[PDB]
Amino acid sequence: EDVDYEKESKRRKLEDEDFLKLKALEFSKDIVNEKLQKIIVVTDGMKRLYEYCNCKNSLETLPSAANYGSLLKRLNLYNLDHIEMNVNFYELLFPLTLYNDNDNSDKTLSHQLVNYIFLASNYFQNCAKNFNYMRETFNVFGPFKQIDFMVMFVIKFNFLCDMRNFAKLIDELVPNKQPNMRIHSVLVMRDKIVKLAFSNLQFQTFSRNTKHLQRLIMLMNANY
Amino acid sequence: MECPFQIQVCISDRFFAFPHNLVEPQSDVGNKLIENLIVYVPTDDDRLYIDKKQFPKFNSVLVYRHEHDVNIDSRSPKKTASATIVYWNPLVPITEIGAGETRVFSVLLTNNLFYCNTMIVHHENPKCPIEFTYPNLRPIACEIPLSHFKELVESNDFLLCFNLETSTMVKILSLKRIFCIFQYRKQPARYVINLPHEEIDNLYNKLNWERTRRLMKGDVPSNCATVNRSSLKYIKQAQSLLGIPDYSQTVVDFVKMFQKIIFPYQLVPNVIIKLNNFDQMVSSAPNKAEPYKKIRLFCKNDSIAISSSGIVPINMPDFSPPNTFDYSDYANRTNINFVTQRVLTDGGFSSGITVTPVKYNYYL
Numbered sequence: 001e002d003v004d005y006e007k008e009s010k011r012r013k014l015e016d017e018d019f020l021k022l023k024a025l026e027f028s029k030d031i032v033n034e035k036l037q038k039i040i041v042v043t044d045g046m047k048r049l050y051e052y053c054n055c056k057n058s059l060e061t062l063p064s065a066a067n068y069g070s071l072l073k074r075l076n077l078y079n080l081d082h083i084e085m086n087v088n089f090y091e092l093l094f095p096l097t098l099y100n101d102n103d104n105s106d107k108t109l110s111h112q113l114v115n116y117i118f119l120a121s122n123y124f125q126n127c128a129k130n131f132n133y134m135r136e137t138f139n140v141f142g143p144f145k146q147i148d149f150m151v152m153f154v155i156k157f158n159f160l161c162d163m164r165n166f167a168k169l170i171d172e173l174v175p176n177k178q179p180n181m182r183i184h185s186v187l188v189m190r191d192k193i194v195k196l197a198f199s200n201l202q203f204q205t206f207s208r209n210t211k212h213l214q215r216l217i218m219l220m221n222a223n224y
Numbered sequence: 225m226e227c228p229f230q231i232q233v234c235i236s237d238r239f240f241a242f243p244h245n246l247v248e249p250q251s252d253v254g255n256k257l258i259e260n261l262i263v264y265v266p267t268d269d270d271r272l273y274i275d276k277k278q279f280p281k282f283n284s285v286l287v288y289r290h291e292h293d294v295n296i297d298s299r300s301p302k303k304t305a306s307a308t309i310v311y312w313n314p315l316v317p318i319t320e321i322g323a324g325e326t327r328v329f330s331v332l333l334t335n336n337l338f339y340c341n342t343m344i345v346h347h348e349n350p351k352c353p354i355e356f357t358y359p360n361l362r363p364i365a366c367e368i369p370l371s372h373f374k375e376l377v378e379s380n381d382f383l384l385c386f387n388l389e390t391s392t393m394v395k396i397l398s399l400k401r402i403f404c405i406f407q408y409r410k411q412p413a414r415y416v417i418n419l420p421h422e423e424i425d426n427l428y429n430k431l432n433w434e435r436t437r438r439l440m441k442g443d444v445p446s447n448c449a450t451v452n453r454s455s456l457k458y459i460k461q462a463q464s465l466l467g468i469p470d471y472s473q474t475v476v477d478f479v480k481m482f483q484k485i486i487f488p489y490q491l492v493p494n495v496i497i498k499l500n501n502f503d504q505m506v507s508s509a510p511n512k513a514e515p516y517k518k519i520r521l522f523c524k525n526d527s528i529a530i531s532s533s534g535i536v537p538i539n540m541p542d543f544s545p546p547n548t549f550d551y552s553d554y555a556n557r558t559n560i561n562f563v564t565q566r567v568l569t570d571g572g573f574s575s576g577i578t579v580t581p582v583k584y585n586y587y588l
Binding site: 009012013016019020023024027178179181184 | 238241272273347348349365368370371373374377408409
């Protein structure tokens, strides 16, 4: 018999060496993030609306949008109050930060990502800056009970198509288990000014076969 | 203060990273299992490196930054058995607890945690890391660790930096985080620090208090540390007087070199006396002027020990008042003066001479 612990103490001493190796394994880069997986799956994922989307230049308003608005009049059947008027900017963008740019890249991509981020920022800034005008120019096509939600959806969808394009372009950058710290912080402060833009966007709302468009609504809401 | 009843602390340096595994679903008596779980953290930064999916045992998991409120402040905190709660390396006292006994997993013993149910699962890490400061550099983002994971493994010379606004507690936290991983590393990486360090030396004193707090239950580890001014200036000067083949040579070198001769000469080096002399506290202690902390020093099989002040018999108070006294016929002022005058004449010296008799202790 040997009741003293020293045996197991030596056992722990042996174990200790593994520690750093195990931790590095636990910190290595991952295969693909489920967030971008979901995004890419949902894109083209239902009833060809994603292929209906052809508007472009990411810097425009009502680009002949009345054509789709005609079918949105039918969509007005649905309870578009399920659409959030806020834009989960940071939340949706978060998966995009899982990239050590020192690897899986020439470290150049950072600049393109920052440019795209500022582009989105200015996009939403102009949208808020002219929403009322946008209200009037789309009410040209007929009032609806939820024209606010319809315009918000139009903005979101318009962006999201280009977002899809941007992802398919910068495809297969391999995600880290963790977001980039610096890029994440920049994102955070950008989202600070974004939410401040939401606040500035003081307004009042105008107030099932959803299961397809319900997917898009969830995605806009960052449901997971 | 104390930990309120039904809370326990697990300290382990390994907990510097979140030990997702260990936690288990708490339940109330009556098997009222509580899959609701909340965790409090110093920062959302912490949350960034925590995976929900680790916890399929639970269906309900949320995490927030701790905030030390006012109104609920109590020795006895609020209770809420409806959810399990954990705090991860908390800095400041907690106001609310979860189902059953709550448990906290932390690396550092705060004063708040003094009288507490505690476990440490400590193990000895041998490899002491080191500082070096020449004034190539590894630059570090001196807070986020995993930013520099593998970097710290690979390189061994790292810069340390802060923005002004940091709370002292946050500084202490991050620093403590460093040294654990460094002792896990296989080589003595060299710290470089961009700070005037004086108050940092003060928090090092605080580390001393903390580590003693550990030692109340701890490993009695051979933990390397040092005074950082009163030591270092004098050590630098001593080497300077010496030949300086390696200005970078570790102190412990000199230490053990001197150690080689102790037993053969059975006496204390002036070097080691100046150590335990010129610390603020663990010394003669200029804080209070307490050379009374003489070193009684013993070695295997000895019938006797070496004091700061000569050989002593074992386990006795440095000198018996009863003695073969330095009887004043010796060390009489008169004879002292006479001999001193002889000396002065012989030297032809005007000034700067003083004399004193020897004195003796237990042994002569």
